[model samples]
Target: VFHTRTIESILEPVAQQISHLVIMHEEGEVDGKAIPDLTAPVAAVQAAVSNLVRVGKETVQTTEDQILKRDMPPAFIKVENACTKLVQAAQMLQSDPYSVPARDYLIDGSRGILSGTSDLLLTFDEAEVRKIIRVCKGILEYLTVAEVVETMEDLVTYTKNLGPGMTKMAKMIDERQQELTHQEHRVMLVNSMNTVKELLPVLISAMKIFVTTKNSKNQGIEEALKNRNFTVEKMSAEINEIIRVLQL
Candidate 1:
């Protein structure tokens, strides 16, 4: 991308080098000069995960959602949840509210390597986690209390919450790679399926909002509302889609 840095940007070179060395060493072992373990790349990958948390973070860009693929809704589902929370937050804005509780649900959930908490895993101290969670909660609360439920506002806030959650969920997946003896994998996969089924439409609707014109020309789709608040609208549509899906 246009970004000068990314977790991949940092890991790509190192991962490739480790793989190369493993192959080279394996070849040498085949001949005579060296002995090699083929699983080297896996270790490098593991190292990448940990190291990224340190010298890793400056390059990690935790704010960005690293998901961009049509077949990946589990990734976007988290984004969708964040988006939904945002919508809920937006709706609840200016109402008699309990922002702190909602904030807790978002943060305490972050403690697990599961609930899309990977990047946030080591990003802060326990106190810091609470602070960030508080900040997110507080922000949505402000939007709610002020009755400022706008599309762009929801988009920004939703996206912010999505990033860390995606990472945590991704890691949880990596852990369940292949425990072949049981239905465990299937259950996890189902969880993922449900997740995506829940969120994909939300993203599509978000796309539609900025897509006033079906025209593919550079003129682009015209904006319908000057407020340009398509995201929230799309998000509402998405929630309906997910609900419809579950009903099925």
Candidate 2:
């Protein structure tokens, strides 16, 4: 349940603080001299940027998506560079109060921080969606192999193999459903999941009967398997639609 909003909430205030620093740098002067000391504000910016970089690094290391792995490092470096430039500008202004180039650096540095952080957050959010989609595909792959369990031993093995994945997927769907903002998408996921639940037992029971009776041509088993496949396919579609809505 990694919420992007958590990172977003942290970012908003930090960005505002940077903006305030930028405004103070632009306007503050004492008797024809720039504010004598910016050591405290500069230190605050350094601490905030360090916290953000640590979080970004942790996210990149933990994330599975290759795109995110490739993209996040550079974005974080850009933020670090921007912070460095701002610190240098503040130091320059301390010595030479009216340095216009120092003021420009401060503005550019803050803008870079904003842009880089926004990019990182957007990429991480997209990676989370892809993670959910990958899980759905994994479940679908398990269901695809459902038709081969003809003997009791094989059925037991199949059930064992499928159980963990099904459990994980069900919980993920439930979590995603709760997170969904649209009522329609939420209801669709719930309905699809309910249908899957109903069809699973029916399919397993049919397979059990087929094994018990030694019937290779059981119409009931075939119908049950078909219905179960259809149900899961529908569930996958619904989940993908919800993911699409989330991406938007």
Candidate 3:
């Protein structure tokens, strides 16, 4: 928020465009008068993704734990696969906007992602915790120091707002913890929060170092960027696993 020309500032409007497109694909009938074409927003995402690669030409190799089993969980892959199918579906719809099959396919694919997200949200003591975490990760590729700070502030607000709902959910979980056959599911929810709590401060601390450095290519700045990227990747993988686990 400090800088007027940060990556997040540049992409916020693009994000909104994609947001509206996603909703239209999910629920709007083919007949809606205001249905916007998704090609521009889709191109925007790819462009941003490409720009991130160029900006971070500095190497930052990240490794995955065998304990986590893979780079991405099955549900995460499923959602991604559905999205790939959605591209084909949308292409067909572009040629024949009223095509029932293409429209149905897009709805089903988006529904799959939404359903997976919902399942994971239910596992959280506070659903907004997952929402904010996902939001933070969504903008990971485009993160600047100022953008990271805003996300941290948003996380603070989300965490603060959870004061009562979190307590209630924790107590409810405790009462049901002993009775549920899948007690690990209950434990996983708490661990998910713990994971976020452990990482956010570290990320913020690294970001502070990153922001203060004057040189874009300074060694310290590169290390800070590497740290930030690793943290973002790990947090994203954890959330994906949490969703996959709950799906079981």
Candidate 4:
């Protein structure tokens, strides 16, 4: 099925379309409130995936072509078997925030992405990638027709507009860093920086995840690093400068 035109015509595009749909939804609102909880729309997506597995997969199998059908079911089964994971990931963003592991991932995950000192920086870390992918998969796990809604309201609202949230970011980062056992005190200062403030909420959250996961070697690191352009590079230089200052 990997080589078949059937999958290219349907499945790959489904993933891409679902992602873009969620991104667009991130910008919309209703009556000064979040439009709605994603419970209904997320179920609709599970149904769509179910339809493709039940209908689309069968359509391929029952087609006149014999070789493709044999190959198609394995491919179909591959997708079908994974449907539960997607929904569970969606469930986790809301549920896991209350737990330490997921909470650590989100906070540090955001920070590392902003700073460019993350697992995806130079090379791919598949383990880290899977964890991060799960979060996004959760956030994007909803109807193609539904606007992108956050699994947890706080994640979206915090990062969506980060200006007023700088202090919160700093405090959270400070707290998470202290939790790492045997880690020495290192003050990484941010000079009065309005420019850097833009990404602080995300930055701090990532730091929390970084320190927490590092303590347990068996637990994997969270993935970060995205859109590292001039602005982020400049901000990262400031992080470097802070590190430099700490050595003195």
Candidate 5:
């Protein structure tokens, strides 16, 4: 199926497309979220390996033909694949993909990427990347053509917008850390725990409305919402982790 001429026609543009596609899927489908850290998955090697394998293998397979067929050599492919495997291994740490193991990887896996702490950590821990890819796949599957197009437009905005958004999030994290050093623990917990208060009602209202109105493609908004839940869960977990850190 992948003859030279056809694949040649597809590869360059498609690689660019994936790079571009990355933004919206991360923002929109992931609901401006990311998965757990690398350490989350690495905590238990036996249970986690399969998660890593599923994600790593699927992603490598997803991008392999492009890597193999590229005209230029890429040392980065090795790093990316290695990261993919790391994610899979981390994913198997718990029965639920949303459990503590997954959370650790999303939070900490990027240590290698950010700190150059390990040869393997030079990029996102595997589960994070997998989450992005998985979210993209879900959107492509569950979205209407119009919704998908809107998402593409959002991607265009996201690539340009997301970096700034992330900067704000980083600042909040920094502020939170500073606050924690001196702030009272129970007070902070109460403030943070109350976030679900302002959030969940709005969410349930929107979902109820969407469900009350039906669609034609047999694609309910539920799938997109579920993916959103994954991201939300990660957020809630991080907040809990912060509270834990504040106590100790």
Candidate 6:
């Protein structure tokens, strides 16, 4: 959200001004005058572009995220180059007024800025989803630990440690699910989440009984443990499925 808002603040105005300049170029006039002076508008666009590039560079420098560092530079470069072309074209059109090539360049440059900004936004969103996936994998590890817990003390400790992780995972999943556009994917996530909620208490109960009885050979304890393991395996599979879909 922070990144989106920040980037939008820098990009939106530039986009708006560029579109205005393009419309003025096409009409060959603004209001009632014959496209008077282009110096001010062009200079404003240049300044906005400079601000965008400066902020982009600053973001890339300060961020330690590998994906952002790897992906964002090209996107920023695209916008920078597009804006430069646009400024040049605007100046050319100022002189010629009816130059088809300048008008074409202006249109192309505007589209480039828009598409480049879209890519940049998408990169941020995908990186965030990857973070959520990382948390999901951590929760899976916690689930594995749950399977090996043999003593009541260990179970208690494991549960305590797991609570926060699950809470975070749930929050992230819920937020992401709401953002997802596909109904099928949303339904899948909801089902997996419900499965986890239903199976968690059952698994804990099985572990509790095994620890309390201290009887590994008892048939009922054996079946209960097996059942819990199966349930955990199912949960893990479901979570992995969600992760796979997210990666897509």
Clashes (candidate 6): 0
Query: Candidate 5 at residue 119, lDDT?
Result: 20
Candidate 4 lDDT, 22-111, residue by residue in tens: 454355321123223444655675675566557645556455545444444554444444444444534655654333333233233223
- C-alpha RMSD for every candidate: 24.1, 4.7, 20.7, 27.3, 24.7, 4.9
**Each prediction's number of clashing residue pairs:** 9, 0, 0, 11, 25, 0
Task: Tell me each candidate's TM-score.
Answer: 0.22, 0.72, 0.32, 0.27, 0.21, 0.78
Candidate 5, superposed: residue stretches over 4 Å from native: 1-187, 213-231, 242-247
Output the lDDT of residue 156, model 1: 60
Off by over 4 Å in 3: 1-180, 214-217
- Evaluate model 3: give its lDDT: 0.48
Looking at candidate 4, what is the lDDT of residue 112? 27
Clashes of 5: 25
Q: Which candidate is the best by lDDT?
A: 6
User: Residues 1-248, candidate 1, lDDT per residue (tens digit)?
Assistant: 11112333433464455456446544643233322232343234334434433433443344232321221334234433443443343233325243443333322222221232222332322222233334333333332221232355555665565556434533433343332223544354446435544443454354445443333443444452322344434333433342232222
Q: Please, what are the lDDT tens digits per residue for candidate 5 over residues 28-137?
A: 55333444554543445334433543554555555544432241123233334445545654555434544544433433333222222122221222323343334333
Show the lowest summed lDDT stretch of 10 residues, model 2: 28-37
Query: 3 or 4: which has the higher lDDT?
Result: 3
Give the alpha-carbon lDDT of every model. Answer: 0.37, 0.71, 0.48, 0.39, 0.40, 0.75
**1 or 4, which is superior by lDDT?**
4
The 10 consecutive residues of candidate 5 with the worst lDDT sum are 113-122
Residues 156-237 of candidate 6: C-alpha lDDT, one tens digit per residue: 8977887787778878888887776667778888788778767777777877876765555565766767776887798799
TM-score, model 2 to reference: 0.72
Model 3 lDDT tens row, 1-248: 11112333444564466457567655754444333565665455345434433332221123222322232244345555556556666677678766767766656665554443333223222232334334434433323322344244554553354344334433443443333345567677557656754665676666556565533446676667677678767655665555444344
Q: Tell me the deviation in Å of residue 44 in model 1.
A: 35
Output candidate 3 Cα RMSD. Answer: 20.7
